[PDB]
């Protein structure tokens, strides 16, 4: 085994980085960009889709977690399979499934079918990170592999910014009407299609063929690589003098057995320690990162809510008689008023409350109302015509000889206003995504100088320390700075992981092990999101404690990992 890895390292090491490597880099960054775009869609869609699709808060949470659940399943499935059927074929299958289901999700009406489409889209896109990294790792040599793999992490943020830009450039046009959020979904379903388009032109890497006793295809693929790189470097005189490489329903059951064997061989005596260290590291890092990255926007929203409450204005003791009104009201309280023989026509209300009021012989007609209530109010001989007033809008009131006529149809569930303040979401996500650029650059430049282990541990401990500064920012302005700081100072820890997991497992098990670890990452992400979403407003010590302890565990386990810098990839 090890002898082949020496010979394999020798072939590509001579042809050197060149045309073929950059071509594969771009055509694989397309798949990574597709993943980055996919993980943002449902988030930029909930505020607008919550009206058409009549979405409760429970449905919002389930939709928020469906992408991560699908990504977990897809990572495990496609990683397990790719070690048998190849990397190119499996990536094509998974990306095509993602594109198909993500396109169908745009022309879908019901909530359950939308959830199913999004889950299958996540299953399709789960296997991009493992297959892409493992597959590109087999066209690189050890002198600079770490930097080469680290520049491949840049396309994920490119996809994030693409999704944010399209969301900003499509969703706010609320007057189009099929509204604009479906168009945003369809437009964001494109990079996967381009990924299949650009992936069909690339050979299946020769390492898989060699590991599968298919040295002929390995030789022809290596010949393509050499020919392309030499044609690039303007040295057609050179000849590929390298000789042949060293030689070493039932179908579904056989594939399942082979995948199970690959997975079970990861816990063998050689790889038990490494595998357990990696399980702990991936779990802890994912838990902390996802918990914080979803806790920050929630805190911004809650702090804005407190400001909104502090901006309310109260109107006590108003008496109105024989007056008509058609003027929109917002963020107001009206207490202890009396309205006799009043007509309210074309009235729009938002976050308006009425307490201890009295209505007698009044007349409502065509009233819209969000977060509007009637507490301890009395109605006598009042008529409600074509109104948005539901049963739950009357809290502790009593109505005598009133009437509801032409009751306006629509979603009964409230908090479903077409337009919510989602602009802040787009800009916050855009800044958070840009925060990873300096981290990506420094990590890519210094991975092969500092080393995988040292960079991983340093970034992890720095993030653990930076978490303590959470309490130092209590304003909406400080939370953005903290979000950019945590995101940009922790991204290196992720890159060092992707390079470190790739270089630590045998070529026959690299995709299986990486897929299992990414599935564990997505599971930990789900758990972290769930736990941390219950801390907003409660306090500020709990998130600090949880995310500092988890990153401490991660750094402790990370420091006990082998080193892979300057070692041949086996």
């Amino acid at each position, epitope marked *: 085994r090890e002898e082949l890895a020496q010979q394999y390292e020798a072939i590509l090491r001579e042809c050197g980085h060149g045309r073929f490597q950059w071509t594969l880099y771009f055509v694989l960054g397309l798949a990574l960009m597709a993943d980055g775009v996919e993980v943002f869609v449902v988030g930029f869609v909930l505020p607008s889709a919550e009206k058409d699709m009549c979405l409760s808060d429970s449905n919002k949470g389930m939709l928020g977690l469906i992408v991560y659940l699908g990504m977990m399943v897809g990572a495990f499935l496609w990683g397990g399979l790719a070690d048998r059927l190849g990397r190119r074929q499996c990536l094509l299958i998974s990306l095509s499934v993602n594109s198909v289901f993500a396109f169908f999700s745009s022309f879908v009406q019901g909530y359950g079918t939308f959830l199913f489409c999004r889950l299958l889209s996540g299953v399709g896109i789960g296997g991009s990170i493992p297959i892409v990294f493992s597959y590109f790792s087999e066209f690189l040599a050890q002198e600079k592999r770490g930097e080469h793999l680290s520049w491949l992490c840049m396309f994920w943020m490119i996809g994030g910014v693409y999704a944010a830009a399209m969301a900003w450039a499509i969703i706010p046009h609320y007057g189009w009407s099929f509204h604009s959020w479906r168009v945003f979904v369809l437009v964001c379903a494109f990079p996967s299609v381009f990924a299949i388009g650009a992936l069909t032109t690339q050979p299946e890497s020769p390492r898989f063929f060699l590991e599968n006793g298919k040295h002929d295809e390995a030789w022809m693929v290596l010949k393509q690589v050499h020919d392309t790189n030499m044609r690039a470097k303007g040295h057609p005189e050179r000849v590929f003098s390298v000789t042949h490489i060293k030689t070493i329903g039932v179908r579904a059951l056989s594939l399942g057995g082979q995948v199970w064997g690959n997975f079970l061989s990861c816990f063998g005596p050689e790889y038990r320690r490494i595998t357990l260290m990696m399980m702990g590291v991936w779990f802890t890092m994912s838990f902390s990162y996802y918990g914080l990255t979803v806790w920050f926007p929630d805190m911004i929203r809650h702090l804005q809510a407190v400001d909104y409450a502090a901006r309310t204005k109260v109107f006590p003791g108003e008496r109105v008689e024989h007056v008509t009104f058609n003027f929109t009201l917002e963020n107001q309280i009206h207490r202890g008023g009396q309205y006799f023989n009043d007509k309210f026509i074309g009235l729009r209300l938002k976050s308006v409350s009425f307490e201890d009021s009295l209505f007698e012989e009044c007349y409502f007609e065509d009233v819209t109302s969000s977060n509007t209530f009637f507490r301890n109010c009395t109605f006598i001989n009042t008529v409600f015509y074509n109104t948005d007033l*539901f*049963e*739950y809008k*009357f809290v502790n009131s*009593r*109505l*005598v000889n*009133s009437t509801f006529l032409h*009751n306006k149809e629509g979603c009964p569930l409230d908090v479903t206003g077409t337009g919510e303040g989602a602009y802040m979401v787009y800009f916050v996500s855009f800044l958070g995504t840009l925060a990873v650029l300096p981290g990506n650059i420094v990590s890519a430049l210094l991975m092969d100088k500092i080393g995988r282990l040292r960079m991983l541990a340093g970034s992890s401990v720095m993030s653990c320390v930076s978490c303590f500064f959470l309490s130092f920012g209590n304003s909406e302005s400080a939370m953005i700075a903290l979000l950019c700081l945590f995101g940009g100072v922790s991204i290196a820890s992720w890159n060092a992981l992707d390079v470190l997991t790739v270089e630590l497992y045998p070529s026959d098990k690299r995709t299986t092990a990486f897929g299992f670890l990414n599935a564990l990452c997505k599971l930990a992400a789900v758990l972290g999101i769930s736990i941390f979403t219950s801390f907003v407003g409660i306090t500020k010590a709990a998130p600090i404690l949880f995310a500092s302890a988890a990153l401490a565990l991660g750094s402790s386990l990370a420091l006990k990992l082998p080193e892979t810098r300057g070692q041949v990839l086996q």
Partner: nanobody
Amino acid sequence: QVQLVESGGGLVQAGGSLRLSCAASGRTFSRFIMGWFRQAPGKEREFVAAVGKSGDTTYYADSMSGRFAISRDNAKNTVYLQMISLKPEDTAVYYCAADSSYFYHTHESEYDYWGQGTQVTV
């Protein structure tokens, strides 16, 4: 299908007081507006009162408030109609019904289920 059963009727002396209890046996009881109707001899079922989905707000028909008090207990899974100062006019069969909607309704058609009935004689 929620089954509603009424009780507490009978003959009552004029100017007295009486209470009608409507028991429901379905875990899903708090998702309906509970309406009390009455049917007099020769007339139709006329809406009397209704109580919302959380026991906060009531909805009284015309000429009823002052003699009818409607409430609901969500722990005992029941609805209550208290009547007082009963006159000879208030002789009828009282029915209990459920509406699953999000608007208060006085039309008998809009109510989903219906109770058996009780008799009140003055």
